[model samples]
Target: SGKVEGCMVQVTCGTTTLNGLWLDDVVYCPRQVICTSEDMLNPNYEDLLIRKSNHNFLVQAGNVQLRVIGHSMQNCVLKLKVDTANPKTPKYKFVRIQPGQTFSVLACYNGSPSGVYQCAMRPNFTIKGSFLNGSCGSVGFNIDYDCVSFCYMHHMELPTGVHAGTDLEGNFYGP
Candidate 1:
């Protein structure tokens, strides 16, 4: 009957194939400010816009979906689709998250419950903030990509929680 300690968490990505994209801005948040509960990491800001030459895209973390919409008002927005309907009409409903609002959700690791994570986007190609520790942070992207207007981040982080001693020497393990 024991819980693991000295367990550090990190996010990594595997063989990301970002074609027709531009690697723009990346702002890593301070560890002290970001190393807490996911709900506390909310941004009190409005929609982050895109450049005239930047293309719109979608980013998915678990069941939550984020997309860029509109021409003049190219605001990036996020929504969650969940199926909590009745037996007859058991449909996945949509939940809109307004800017600077608090929302709660669950995160899983392999098959275990972890914590939560957050993402913030900014104008003209930017990923403002991300939380890496205690967060089962994984991301997949889809885009309306064009040859001329596509920007992206080169390195992607896919963090997970693991038991200690098994977290060393590049000895990748599978079960």
Candidate 2:
């Protein structure tokens, strides 16, 4: 019969050197290793930007993407009738947000309107705006925000749903 010996090692984040030591029936390695912090070992947003084109405001979070198409010359207005029985004054109301700028509905005259809304980014990347209503009316115009611009970088570990792994033959692998 033959005795089996095995060594368990923890892989760390930095440069290292290893030596051998005997423990029980197994050989343990005393490795001279330089341990690094997670942030130091991993690439961050700034590192990713190296390959990207220069832009003003960079999107650091979320999957939201905004693109501005055109704008409306007149003020955007929405009318709502609260009650049907009282036809004389059927809740005459309107809502509007200026064009060529970013707008969010903090509150409405009545309760908040129920519908899908979108924000827009212009070609020059200067002005920005949010449209509560659908794309309608010349009042809503696309303006690039002079102060802010959009630049995006995706920080995903896997590529195309594949995990970085090694083969049975111990070959290194990557996406």
Candidate 3:
């Protein structure tokens, strides 16, 4: 292959030159979305944004394709699923959030599902929410934390679930 550096970024989970979006934003330093379904002892946030032309330059984390229709506005940020058109709530792993912090989307979104969404952090979950309609929950005991421009909590008391799939480690929901 010839030396090429046109509108692309390198992504990786283990040790392979995977692909990711390039120039999705001009503010950051060539942000590349990297994803994985593996266990995370300490999970952080992945930055994702859609281009102005409705379609997004995306990378495949495991099998999750983060695609939005008509932007975050006029619709909820939908993850292009395997066999469906209805957009599902975008989820990510936030195993822990210390008190006094704001949870917000990295890129952009305006109306519809509403920016800064209603976050329901189950103290625990069946599995670490990852790709393809994944979620973490404490089964029948999950609670909604209300929507806001920015969200932060005084504290979080993660009451574990008896039927929880895996520990809430490396699990997240509705990013």
Best lDDT goes to which candidate?
3
In model 2, which regions exceed 4 Å deviation? 1-8, 13-161, 172-175
Task: Give the top-scoring candidate (TM-score).
Answer: 1
Give the alpha carbon lDDT tens digit for every residue of 1-175 in model 1: 0011111112211221111110111111111121223422663313222222113332222243323232222112121122221122211112222223322222234313355333333222223233322322222121222111111111222333221110011111121
Give the local distance difference test score of model 1.
0.22
Write the residue-wise lDDT of candidate 3 on 33-118 in tens digits. Answer: 22223322332323223322333333332344434333221111122222222132212222344322323221111101112222
TM-score, predicted candidate 2 vs. hidden true structure: 0.14
Error of 1 at 164 (Å): 27
Worst 10 residues of 2 by lDDT: 1-10
How many steric clashes does model 3 contain? 6
Q: What is the lDDT of residue 111 in candidate 1?
A: 18
For candidate 3, the lDDT comes to: 0.23
* CA shift of 135, model 2, Å: 46
Model 2's C-alpha root-mean-square deviation from the true structure amounts to 29.5
**CA lDDT, candidate 1, residue 88:** 27
- Residue 56 in model 3: shift from native, Å? 3.1
Tens-place lDDT digits, model 2, residues 1-175: 0010111112111242221111122211211111123533663433332332312111111132111121111111111111112112111112222234552221111112233223332333222222221211111112234211111101111333322211111122222
